[PDB]
Structures are given as structure tokens and as C-alpha cells.
Amino acid sequence: VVNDYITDISTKKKLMETKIEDKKHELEAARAELHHWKTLKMPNPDRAKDTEAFRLQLLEDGQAFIPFYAAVEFQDDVTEEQKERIESALKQTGILDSLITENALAPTHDRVIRPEPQLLGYTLADYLRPDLEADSLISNKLVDEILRSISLEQEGAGFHVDVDGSYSLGCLVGHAPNEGPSKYIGRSSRKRYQQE
Amino acid sequence: RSISLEQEGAGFHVDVDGSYSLGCLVGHAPNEGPSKYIGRSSRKRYQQEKIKECQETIEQLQLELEELKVQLSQYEENLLQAAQWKQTMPTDQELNDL
Amino acid sequence: VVNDYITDISTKKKLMETKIEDKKHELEAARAELHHWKTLKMPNPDRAK
Numbered sequence: 001v002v003n004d005y006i007t008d009i010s011t012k013k014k015l016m017e018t019k020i021e022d023k024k025h026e027l028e029a030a031r032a033e034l035h036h037w038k039t040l041k042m043p044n045p046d047r048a049k050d051t052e053a054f055r056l057q058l059l060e061d062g063q064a065f066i067p068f069y070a071a072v073e074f075q076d077d078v079t080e081e082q083k084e085r086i087e088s089a090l091k092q093t094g095i096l097d098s099l100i101t102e103n104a105l106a107p108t109h110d111r112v113i114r115p116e117p118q119l120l121g122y123t124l125a126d127y128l129r130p131d132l133e134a135d136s137l138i139s140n141k142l143v144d145e146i147l148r149s150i151s152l153e154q155e156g157a158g159f160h161v162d163v164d165g166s167y168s169l170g171c172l173v174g175h176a177p178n179e180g181p182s183k184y185i186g187r188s189s190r191k192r193y194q195q196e
Numbered sequence: 197r198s199i200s201l202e203q204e205g206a207g208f209h210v211d212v213d214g215s216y217s218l219g220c221l222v223g224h225a226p227n228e229g230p231s232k233y234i235g236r237s238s239r240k241r242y243q244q245e246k247i248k249e250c251q252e253t254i255e256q257l258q259l260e261l262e263e264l265k266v267q268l269s270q271y272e273e274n275l276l277q278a279a280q281w282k283q284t285m286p287t288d289q290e291l292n293d294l
Numbered sequence: 295v296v297n298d299y300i301t302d303i304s305t306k307k308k309l310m311e312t313k314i315e316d317k318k319h320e321l322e323a324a325r326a327e328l329h330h331w332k333t334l335k336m337p338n339p340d341r342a343k
Contacts, residue, residue, distance in 0.1 A: 007297050011304035018308065048226035098221070106215070108224045116206045116220035149220045157198055157208055159219025170208045170218045171198040177342035233337050243334045250328035257321035264310050264317065271307040278300050 040194045045069050045097040045184050050109030055099075057108070064102035064137040068113070071100050071143050073131030073186040082163065083182035083189070086127060089165040092176040096184055100146050102138050113146050122152040124161060131186065 045067075058065050068090065074083050090096040098111040105112045125147030130140040151160035154168055161167040165176035183193040200209035203217065210216040214225040231238040 003297055007301060007304070010297070010301040011308065014301060014305040015308055018305070018312075050226035054224075095221075098223075106222050106224075108215075109226045111221060111223035114206075114220050114222055118220050146220075155219060159208075159221055168219075170210065170216065179342075233339055239334075239337050242337045243331050246331040246334070247328060250324050250331060253324040254321060254328060257317050257324060261314065261317040261321065264314055268307060268310045268314075271303055271310065274303050275300065275307075278296055278303070281296060 042190050043193050047097055054108050054110040063105055065099045066136050066138050068098045069096050069184040070133045071130055072128045075129055078127050080181045085165045087182045087185050088176035088179040089161045089167050093161060093167045093169055100138055100143055102142060115142060115146050115149055118149040118151050123148040124150040
């Protein structure tokens with residue numbers, strides 16, 4: 001009987017060993033994730049491998065380009081609610097990762113904001129100022145002009161992104177959902193995604 | 197029809213190869229796999245492929261679970277046989293009597 | 295000695311039980327998913343709630 005009891009206890013001790021193994025392994029997975037977040041430096045927006053291939057093609061071509069999130073930063077007076085609205089609309093439209101190009105480029109597997117004149121009504125340039133990165137190949141005057149390109153009123157069946165988050169894409173008109181505080185737009189925001 | 201299949205200058209159009217012009221913007225779409233959303237055939241293909249995946253997963257998991265049942269049954273038989281072993285264990289009856 | 299061996303066997307029985315739980319979690323989800331795809335109204339593109 002005593003050995004029956006101790007056998008049971010030994011089995012459960014083994015179960016304790018197994019769960020110690022399990023928790024060590026869970027802590028190792030958590031540790032690996034923690035290591036990944038600790039050695040992060042700058043997370044970028046959503047992309048497809050085709051867009052990366054195309055942008056490699058652009059680099060091989062030497063075309064002047066810089067992604068939008070890497071191109072602009074919000075102004076001081078633009079509090080977190082406004083940042084959220086503008087970044088959510090850009091992300092929903094995909095404009096967030098869209099490319100600003102010095103020349104009228106046509107993208108393959110990618111999107112380019114050609115500086116075609118969209119100088120009618122209010123624009124996002126009112127709220128945003130350019131923020132050029134270390135790899136910038138484009139001047140801020142053109143970027144500012146593109147910021148003016150993004151309109152805040154319907155161009156019929158055309159392109160615009162309002163401050164309240166609505167956007168028109170071709171025949172489409174849209175409004176963005178909640179996405180939380182800004183993480184991609186601005187130097188502070190890109191690092192912030194990493195910290196939580 | 198509000199969507200053209202030939203370049204409309206700076207205007208709005210979406211070509212067959214996936215390129216599109218939407219104002220000052222020009223874009224081209226990435227890989228998204230075979231059509232899944234547009235049309236009954238595409239939606240049904242999505243449904244059938246998802247169904248096939250889940251059916252194969254249920255089959256594999258059932259096979260593994262029946263294998264697990266076999267292992268557990270063998271382990272129970274082993275414990276039983278251990279108890280049976282206890283009975284077969286030698287006894288010192290003759291030596292103690294002597 | 296028999297009890298040393300039997301503790302190991304109990305452990306392996308326990309591992310089978312743990313993997314039975316595991317099969318329960320993957321296979322129950324697969325059954326639910328298969329029913330859902332049978333009851334698929336439509337495919338949903340990228341969306342927010």
C-alpha cells in the first residue's frame with residue numbers, strides 16, 4: 001500500500017517534471033519573442049513580397065523613391081486623435097506604404113503617388129510636414145506638394161483622403177475604422193509600435 | 197463601367213493585368229492567389245478547398261488519436277501485467293518452512 | 295525495480311493523456327472549422343470589425 005501511494009506520488013512528481021519542462025519551454029518561446037522585440041530597430045508597414053521585388057527593381061533602376069510613412073511626420077498641434085484618423089485612412093487605402101517618386105513613375109506590384117495636380121480644396125499637407133529618412137532621394141518641396149495632392153474633398157470618382165478618415169479610390173468612397181494611436185507616421189510613432 | 201481597361205491619362209482605370217490609375221496615383225496589384233471572392237465558382241472553390249483542408253486535418257488527427265488510444269491501451273495492459281507480475285514474483289515459502 | 299519501471303510507464307500514459315488533450319484542441323477546432331466552411335455564406339476580404 002505504501003508503495004502504491006509512493007508510486008502515485010512518483011508519477012505525479014514525474015508530472016511535475018514534465019510541467020517544469022513545459023514551462024521552461026514556454027519561457028524559452030517567450031524569451032525568444034522578447035529577444036526579437038528587444039533587438040528591433042524600426043518596424044515598417046504592411047507589404048507584399050511583390051512590392052519588395054518591385055522596389056528592388058526601382059533601386060536597380062535608380063529611380064528616386066521614398067515610402068510615405070518614411071516621407072512625412074505629423075505636426076505638433078496634431079494630437080493623437082487626429083494622428084489616428086489620418087493614419088487609419090492612409091493604412092486602409094494602403095497609401096501609408098505608398099511611394100513618393102520624383103519622376104512620374106508607374107509601379108509594378110506597387111503604388112506610386114505621382115505628383116499629378118490635385119491642388120483643389122483642403123489637403124493633408126495642412127496637417128503634415130515631410131520627414132525625410134536616411135535613404136531619401138527626394139526633396140521636401142515635392143513631398144509637400146504630394147501632401148497637397150492628397151485632397152480632403154471628393155474629386156468625383158477620383159482620389160482624396162479627408163482628415164476625418166474618409167478616402168476615395170477610383171469609383172470608391174470610404175471611411176476608416178479605429179486603429180489606435182499612430183505607429184507608422186513620424187519617428188516617435190515607428191519606435192512606439194516596438195515598445196509595447 | 198466606372199472602371200476602364202485602358203490608361204485614362206491621369207484619370208481612373210484598372211487594367212486586366214492588375215495595374216490601375218486612381219487620380220494622381222498609379223498602382224499595380226501584388227500576388228493574392230486564385231480568385232476567391234468574385235463569383236459563385238470562386239467562393240465555392242474557397243469553400244471546397246477549406247473544407248478539404250479541415251477534412252484532411254480531422255482525418256490525420258483522428259488517426260493520431262486512435263494511435264494514442266492504442267498506446268494508452270497498451271500502457272493499461274502493461275500496468276495490469278505489472279500487477280500480474282507481482283503475483284508471479286518468487287516466494288520463499290519452502291525456504292521459510294525449512 | 296518494478297515500481298521504478300511502472301513510474302516510467304505511468305509517465306508515458308500521462309504523455310498519452312496530454313497528447314489526447316492536444317488532439318482534442320486541434321481536432322475539435324478542425325471539426326468546427328469544417329462545419330463552418332460547410333456553412334460558409336461567403337469569403338470575407340480584409341476588414342475591420
